[PDB]
C-alpha cells in the first residue's frame, strides 16, 4: 500500500488550519500551482491501518489530487520543504 500523497486545498487558509495540529512522523512539502496550493505528504513506515487512519484527518481540510507528483517537482512552485506543515504553524497560529 502506498505511503505518499498529494493534496489540493481550495484556499490557503485551509492549510494554516491543518497546520494547527500534529504532523507526526510525517515529512511534508508544499507547492503552489494553478493558484491553488497542493501539499505533499510522506509517511515513513506506518501500518496501513495507521495511515488510512491519519489520511482521514487530512482530507477534512483537503481533497486528494490525481496530480502526478513529478509534475509539481518540475513545473510547480516550491514554498516549504520537508517540514511544510510545521513552518506554517510557526508564522500563523497566533
Amino acid at each position: 500500500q502506498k505511503l505518499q500523497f498529494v493534496l489540493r486545498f481550495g484556499d490557503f487558509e485551509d492549510v494554516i488550519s491543518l497546520s494547527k495540529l500534529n504532523v507526526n512522523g510525517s515529512k511534508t512539502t508544499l507547492y503552489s500551482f494553478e493558484n491553488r496550493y497542493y501539499l505533499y505528504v510522506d509517511f515513513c513506515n506506518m501500518t496501513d491501518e495507521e495511515v488510512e487512519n491519519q489520511l482521514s484527518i487530512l482530507l477534512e481540510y483537503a481533497t486528494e489530487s490525481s496530480i502526478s507528483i513529478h509534475r509539481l517537482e518540475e513545473y510547480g512552485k516550491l514554498i516549504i520543504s520537508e517540514h511544510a506543515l510545521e513552518t506554517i504553524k510557526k508564522h500563523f497560529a497566533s
Binding site: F9, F12, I16, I57, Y61, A62, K77
Partner: protein, 437 residues
C-alpha cells in the same frame, strides 16, 4: 447555511460546544458527529444509539486521534470538509421531500462525503459506512381493476384521489360545474368541452365533478366514477377502458375517438374549439361546449387565501388579507386583459419573491471595502510564495481585520429582512403595476 429544525440547529451549534470542549480550532466532520450523538434525541441521535455508538465510545476514539487543545478559540470556523457535509444534508433532503433539514439529514450528509474524520471514527469502530446509512433509513417512510393500466401518471385519479378526504374547498364556478353535468348525461351532444380563456379556473371545474360525485349528490347514473387526467404507450392503457367504464377523462391540449366509451372534459380556447367542429362533425355530435365566466371578484379573493398557506412557501404570506384585496380588484378593471381569477395570483408571485429578493440585496456605500479587501488577500498571496511569511502573516492578520469588518454590515442586513420580511400590504402589490400600465 440556511434553516433546519431546532434539532438540526441545536446539533450544529452543539458541534461548536464540542469544538471547544477539546480546545481544537476548526470544527470538522468529527464534531458534527459528536453534535448528533450528544443531543441524544434527534433521529440522527437515535440511530447512533443503534449501531452501538454512544457518546462514550465515540469521543474516546476522537480524543485518541486529536486531543488538546490550543484554547485559541480565536472565533473559529468550519472545516472545508464539514462545510461540504452541510451543503450535502441540504441535498440528502431535497432527496426526501423533506421541506426542511434536520438531525437525520446531517447524519445522512456525513456518510455521503465519507472522506473525513467522522467516517474514520466508525470504520475504526467496526461500523462500515452502509450499515450506517441503513439505520437512519429504517426510521423514516412513505406517507384496483382496470386502474392498473390507466393508473400511470398519466394520469392521476381526481375521484378516489379526492375521496380520501384529501380535498380542499373548492370555490367555483359553482354553476360552471353543474353545466358540466347536463352535458355529461345526455346521449346527444354528450361529452362536454370546457372553453374559456385559459387557466385556472378551468382545471378547477373537473376537480368539481370529482368533488360532486363523491360527496355525493348527483344523478342520471354517475356513481363510482373516476375523473382521470394529464406515444410508445398510446392506446395501450386505453383498452383497460373498453373493458370497464367508470371513467371520465380530463384533457389538456388529438382524438383517438369515440370508438365507444371515452368520457372526457375539454381543455380548449375560444377559438381552439373551432379547430375541431370545422373539419367536423364529431363536435356538433359527441364533444359539446360550455364557457368559464371569470370567477366572482369576491370568490376571487377567498380563492387565494386557500393557496395563501401554500405560498407561505416563499416568506411573507400568509397575509395580508389587505394584500390580496389588491391583487384581485386591480385586475378586474385595471388591465384587464386576462381572466378574473388567473391574473391576481400572478401578481402576488412578482411580489411572491420580489420581497425575499429585495430582502437579500446589498449594503451601503460598502462596496469599496470589498475592492480594498481584494488586493490585500492578493498582496498576501504573492508574498507567501516568496515567504516573506511574517511580511504577510502581517497581511493575513490584516486581511482578516477587514473580513469580520464587512460581515457586521452584511449580518447587519438581517436588519434588512425586518423592513420587508413578511411585510405584504398593497404597498408591494401595486407598484408592481406602474409597469403593466
Amino acid at each position: 447555511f440556511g434553516r433546519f429544525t431546532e434539532r438540526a440547529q441545536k446539533v450544529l451549534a452543539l458541534a461548536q460546544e464540542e469544538a471547544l470542549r477539546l480546545g481544537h480550532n476548526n470544527i470538522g466532520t468529527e464534531h458534527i458527529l459528536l453534535g448528533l450523538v450528544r443531543e441524544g434525541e434527534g433521529i440522527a441521535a437515535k440511530a447512533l444509539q443503534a449501531l452501538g455508538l454512544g457518546s462514550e465510545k465515540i469521543q474516546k476514539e476522537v480524543e485518541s486521534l486529536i486531543g488538546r487543545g490550543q484554547e485559541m478559540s480565536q472565533t473559529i470556523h468550519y472545516t472545508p470538509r464539514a462545510k461540504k457535509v452541510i451543503e450535502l444534508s441540504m441535498d440528502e433532503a431535497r432527496k426526501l421531500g423533506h421541506s426542511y433539514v434536520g438531525t437525520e439529514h446531517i447524519l445522512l450528509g456525513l456518510i455521503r462525503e465519507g472522506e473525513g474524520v467522522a467516517a474514520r471514527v466508525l470504520n475504526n469502530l467496526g461500523v462500515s459506512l452502509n450499515k450506517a446509512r441503513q439505520q437512519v433509513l429504517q426510521l423514516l417512510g412513505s406517507n384496483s381493476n382496470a386502474n392498473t393500466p390507466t393508473l400511470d401518471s398519466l394520469a392521476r385519479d381526481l375521484t378516489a384521489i379526492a375521496k380520501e378526504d384529501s380535498l380542499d374547498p373548492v370555490i367555483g364556478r359553482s354553476k360552471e360545474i353543474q353545466r358540466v353535468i347536463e352535458v355529461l348525461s345526455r346521449r346527444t351532444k354528450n361529452n362536454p368541452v370546457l372553453i374559456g380563456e385559459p387557466g385556472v379556473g378551468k382545471t378547477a371545474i373537473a376537480e368539481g365533478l370529482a368533488q360532486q360525485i363523491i360527496n355525493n349528490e348527483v344523478p342520471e347514473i354517475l356513481r363510482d366514477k373516476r375523473v382521470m387526467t394529464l406515444e410508445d404507450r398510446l392506446k395501450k392503457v386505453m383498452d383497460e377502458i373498453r373493458q370497464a367504464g367508470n371513467i371520465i377523462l380530463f384533457i389538456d391540449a388529438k382524438p383517438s375517438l369515440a370508438r365507444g366509451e371515452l368520457q372526457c372534459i375539454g381543455a380548449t380556447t375560444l377559438d381552439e374549439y373551432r379547430k375541431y367542429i370545422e373539419k367536423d362533425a364529431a363536435l356538433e355530435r359527441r364533444f359539446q361546449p360550455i364557457q368559464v365566466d371569470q370567477p366572482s371578484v369576491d370568490e376571487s379573493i377567498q380563492i387565494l387565501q386557500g393557496l395563501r398557506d401554500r405560498y407561505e412557501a416563499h416568506h411573507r404570506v400568509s397575509i395580508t388579507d389587505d394584500a390580496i384585496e389588491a391583487a384581485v380588484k386591480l385586475s378586474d378593471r385595471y388591465i384587464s386583459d386576462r381572466f378574473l381569477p388567473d391574473k391576481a395570483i400572478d401578481l402576488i408571485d412578482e411580489a411572491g419573491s420580489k420581497v425575499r429578493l429585495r430582502s437579500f440585496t446589498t449594503p451601503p456605500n460598502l462596496k469599496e471595502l470589498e475592492q480594498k479587501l481584494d488586493e490585500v488577500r492578493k498582496e498576501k498571496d504573492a508574498a507567501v510564495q516568496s515567504q516573506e511569511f511574517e511580511k504577510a502573516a502581517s497581511l493575513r492578520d490584516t486581511e482578516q481585520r477587514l473580513r469580520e469588518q464587512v460581515e457586521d454590515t452584511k449580518k447587519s442586513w438581517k436588519e434588512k429582512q425586518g423592513q420587508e420580511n413578511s411585510e405584504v400590504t398593497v404597498d408591494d402589490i401595486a407598484m408592481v403595476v406602474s409597469s403593466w400600465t
